[PDB]
Design a protein around this ligand. Sequence first.
Ligand SMILES: [Mg+2]
Lengths: 49, 49, 49, 87, 83
Amino acid sequence: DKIHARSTGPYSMITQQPLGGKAQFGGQRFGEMECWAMQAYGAAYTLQE
Amino acid sequence: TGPGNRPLKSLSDLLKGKQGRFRQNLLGKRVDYSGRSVIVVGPQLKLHQ
Amino acid sequence: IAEHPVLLNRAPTLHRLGIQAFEPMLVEGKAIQLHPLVCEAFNADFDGD
Amino acid sequence: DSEAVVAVDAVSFTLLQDQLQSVLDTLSEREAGVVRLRFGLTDGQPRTLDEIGQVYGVTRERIRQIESKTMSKLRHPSRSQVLRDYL
Amino acid sequence: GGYDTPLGITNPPIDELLDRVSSKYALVIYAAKRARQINDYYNQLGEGILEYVGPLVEPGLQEKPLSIALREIHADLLEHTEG
DNA sequence: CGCCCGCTTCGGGGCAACCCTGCCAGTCTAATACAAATCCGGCAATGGAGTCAAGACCAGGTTCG
Ligand SMILES: [Mg+2]
């Protein structure tokens, strides 16, 4: 009930982000603090990706 | 208020607070090519594995 | 899979060492095996995280 | 959002167009030109038998016989074993 | 230079790589642009040959282009200028 | 003489974390009259698009006297 993965599934309606949760296919959330970590590395191209 | 005594979502409420466009969909988005599972200890691996 | 790094997140990401990149290898079962030395940087014990 | 792009069938459509180009180009020029004008591949509107007979300087009956012979040709397994998995 | 024989991702040693460049960001863009050149060589191989130059060192069996880029860097076979 | 400036008090707005997990909320005069608009059901002008039968015929492999 926990293992999950996604290559390309559905997408949201108003905005066009991928969906959420294992009930749908859904992708993980790359929130604010992880963007702060990727900025703090100096790694910028992965953030653009 | 609409039905069920819930206040309607006006135009400024698409931006304000935590549920706005800024702190929810602009800075941190759901991504594709992702996964999630539980972890266990792997003491036979090398450090970079 | 061989020679293709992946990023391993742990939520919440407190600081810069909350995202590190490993080399994967195929492991039976359904649990993400982890090295027992990056647990201090990740701040992750194995109580179901 | 079901009206979005499934993003594997689009690239499969592109590879299908290239495979159909290879299969149609394995034949001659008159056959492939008549087929593409008949089913509307180079343009949106499919040209009719009278239109292809006009552009080929013939009657429509020769165009129809060419169409029947080419459709009898294309159902060969040598020209079908690559296109069978595309439906 | 008395380490054990490395393996996998870290087969070119990073401290032997970082004596060729100034800092690690330059090394990142160095290896990435070399890898883009190598993959553009492989894809335009079936057509006529262009100015893109192939893998200088001998490749593996089925190696990623980025590892070929890193080994070409470590073998001191390229040259680069910053911006 | 009532008029007006320093203090005090009162109130309004903002924020208060981060990973999964989630799947649909209510009600009371009621009719006629008519007219315009839209549709739909069914032949009737085709007429063009395709189908078929036959044949005229150009000329290179294929088999006899
Ligand atoms: Mg824990």
